[PDB]
Design a protein around this nucleic acid. Structure first.
Lengths: 107, 98, 93, 82, 93, 53, 98, 82
DNA sequence: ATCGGATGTATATATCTGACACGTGCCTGGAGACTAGGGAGTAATCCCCTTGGCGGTTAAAACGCGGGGGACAGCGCGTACGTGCGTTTAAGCGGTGCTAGAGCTGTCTACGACCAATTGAGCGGCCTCGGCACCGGGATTCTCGA
DNA sequence: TCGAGAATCCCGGTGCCGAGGCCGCTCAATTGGTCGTAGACAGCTCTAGCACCGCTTAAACGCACGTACGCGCTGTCCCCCGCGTTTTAACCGCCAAGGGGATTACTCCCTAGTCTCCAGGCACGTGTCAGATATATACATCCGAT
């Protein structure tokens, strides 16, 4: 009776069992593909990695160890793909990325 | 002799620091009183979470700065630095808010 | 009352990408909410598609298709790769 | 305890602060109250819908998750509140 | 293939409101698609709120609440009253 | 729709009538402004500055 | 002496009759060829329903007249009767299409 | 049978016809091709997404219900096609 | 176009801390193992929609062609708006105190779930015929020069 | 500005096929048991909200005032509207091939469902430094005289 979680079996972090239970309780399909939780959780791992990476980029760009939601807003506003992904999404304590229009500058 | 910065300049720096800052720009209690006033219209004596009303004010102000932003943009297309109510109205119009 | 989350997992992947960089609880719960939202996105989309296929079962092909629907270009591509990797790593179990 | 006229409780300095955050230089007066109206109108929906949730929630206090699901249904979803 | 629709009930309620009127089959299909749209809308919203209420039972209270969430003003009011009268009639026997 | 069609002296009701009624009811429009309509066309809308003099 | 209506007048009547008419204003075959050309970009040798492509062209033209409409409106706010590409671009901008 | 350049197959008379339908009086030239681009870009999405459906449909022909569900997912739903 | 002065802003420093990383004991969801059904997958068949081509038409597109109409640039003024400084004011801290109402547990019960037996409401298919679409022609009304 | 002319509205008549009505022909709706269970409800907490009140103060309102963009007007250019002509290919009608779409019938791989056990997750304490904050400082930049 050797135990090994499906996350370790995928060598990843996100809980395949937990997310599987979640989608089960989510009432989307009668039966499920056993590898679908693995796959989706891997996707989540990837995207989370990118967004947190950009967040940390801004953070140590500001000498900030602990990342602030402002870092998150800046990250999600800089990347075109992620911004497109989360265009109509709002972020708490987000603020606005730096943006001054051309004619705003006095001549 | 007294010094006075040229117009906009101080407001320009205000813009700069506000894009720099991230916190709210609305006093909490007035906003809360307004929310409760609006609430009693649909039903009286309803309670709220401070977190809930903080969310209300944050999301509002977000929508509001977005409106101010694209109305600024429209006024650029209006070739003016002063804002006009029609800009806001037509912006909502394009925003499908009419 | 036990309230599940993923702060453990988000912190894990944080370290896996940035062992140095820290994290705030506010942004933590932001991450959690966000992943919940996108997971519901993909769930609803895949269920909708399978209902179009009228297939009561939800498999990984649905997931790939629907994330391709969801993600802007190259992300999805990158995404699906690791996903495939995952299931391969899990099918090779 | 009947409330009223907190709409003007929104200060013109607050409005112009938000505008500067939006990156605006010159503003007219006619906006603010107009602005306020919109503000009202905007929130006019959500709270009601929110308490509508609370309506079905059969509760007297109103919670954040209410406005969460509202903005969601209003297509203006927000993060950081569960 | 046995395909199901509602155009017969469309004609029925038409005669109920306008006995001396014809329809384009095109328009009938449009209206039926509209029926399907509003049905999926209300059903999804009801399931979602029940999920928020953690309810696995979608009942008429959910129906009315979700309609109110969806329909505006007197539309919602009249619809609520009508559904109420109808469920009262059905429950009367 | 029947109102519109009889206004147009029409028994058979074409999608145009329905589109017109849609863009004639404000609450229904709000419900359906995000919806597109086959053989709908556009409800007659004339702008002010468009007029001659 | 030859007669010529003043400018716009004929186009004005065209507007009037087009708001009067409801059918398509695009030739079928060119649109279809364009669609198939676009299709082969993502995958070659794909077939279509005439109903499908009719839907494509109708929905397109709908989006297109909507764009023309609100760009007309913007040009009103631009105080011109001539259209400018920037109007369309910024309209898409407000339409979140940027 | 490799296709090309049907974008200009869109006639300027067609464009101005659509504009008149939209209630437009005076138009510039710079629009049309620009217009065309947008058009392309617009359809650029749907067909792909549509055939994406057909992708999962495992079929060689493309159907209306594809674009139906696309415009639905594109929030631009249409009626009259099942 | 520059320099000088004012002012506003980025920096180093110090310490305070309270979020926050970290570790626990305890819980239950997840893993592990086993059983069934039946959704899904495959295959052979049919159909039949589509994709292809061919010829004639013209309405439509291409193109040209003035040319008045407005986009636009500039130019005067003035009113409305930034600003800095006054003023007064509620906003915020914070801390107190009550409880109404969320928020939790424990029933018990009505209530679909589900299945089985039954079938008529409904749906594919087949006439059919009449508003409706088209056409031609006459009368009406807008419009551009007096 | 009263006509000429032109685009349009309307009227009668022609011919048509979709709208509709009806007909076989089910399967999906109804009916009726039957059962385990979602939640309805009662009945407890407790806490987060709700209001109270005081204290400090950053903040808000208004003033005066420069001023400068908004606005309004003029003249130009060019350019897009309107009409005329010439070219074409969309359309339309018909034909034809097949290749895919849909269908049905098997067949069984996989998942739901069950039961067992425990170990990762979660609430909960616990030091503790990232950074918040304040201060003096050094640098950047505007505004006006030159």
């Amino acid at each position: 009776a050797k135990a090994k979680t499906r996350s370790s079996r995928a060598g990843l972090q996100f809980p395949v069992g937990r997310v599987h239970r979640l989608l089960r309780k989510g009432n989307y399909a009668e039966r499920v593909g056993a590898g679908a939780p693995v796959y989706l959780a891997a996707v989540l791992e990837y995207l989370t990695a990118e967004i947190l990476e950009l967040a940390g980029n801004a953070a140590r760009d500001n000498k900030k160890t602990r990342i602030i939601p402002r870092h998150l807003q800046l990250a999600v506003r800089n990347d075109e793909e992620l911004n497109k992904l989360l265009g109509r999404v709002t972020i708490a304590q987000g603020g606005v990325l730096p943006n001054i229009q051309s004619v705003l500058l006095p001549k | 002799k007294p010094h006075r910065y040229r117009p906009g300049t101080v407001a320009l720096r205000e813009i700069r620091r506000y894009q720099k800052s991230t916190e709210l720009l609305i006093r909490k209690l007035p906003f809360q009183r307004l929310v409760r006033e609006i609430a009693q219209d649909f039903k009286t004596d309803l309670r709220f979470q401070s977190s809930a009303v903080m969310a209300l004010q944050e999301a509002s102000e977000a929508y509001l700065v977005a409106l101010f932003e694209d109305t600024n943009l429209c006024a650029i297309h209006a070739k003016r630095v002063t804002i006009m109510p029609k800009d806001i109205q037509l912006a909502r119009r394009i925003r499908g808010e009419r | 009352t036990r309230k599940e989350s993923y702060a453990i997992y988000v912190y894990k992947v944080l370290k896996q990408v940035h062992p140095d960089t820290g994290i705030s609880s506010k942004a933590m719960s932001i991450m959690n909410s966000f992943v919940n939202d996108v997971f519901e996105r993909i769930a609803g989309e895949a269920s909708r598609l399978a209902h179009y296929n009228k297939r009561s079962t939800i498999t990984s092909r649905e997931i790939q298709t629907a994330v391709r629907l969801l993600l802007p270009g190259e992300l999805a591509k990158h995404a699906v790769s690791e996903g495939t990797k995952a299931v391969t790593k899990y099918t090779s179990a | 305890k009947v409330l009223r006229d907190n709409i003007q409780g929104i200060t013109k300095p607050a409005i112009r602060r938000l505008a500067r955050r939006g990156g605006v230089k010159r503003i007219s007066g006619l906006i603010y109250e107009e602005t306020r109206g919109v503000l009202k109108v905007f929130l006019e929906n959500v709270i009601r819908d929110a308490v509508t949730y609370t309506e079905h929630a059969k509760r007297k206090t109103v919670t954040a998750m209410d406005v969460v699901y509202a903005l969601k249904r209003q297509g203006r979803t927000l993060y950081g509140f569960g």
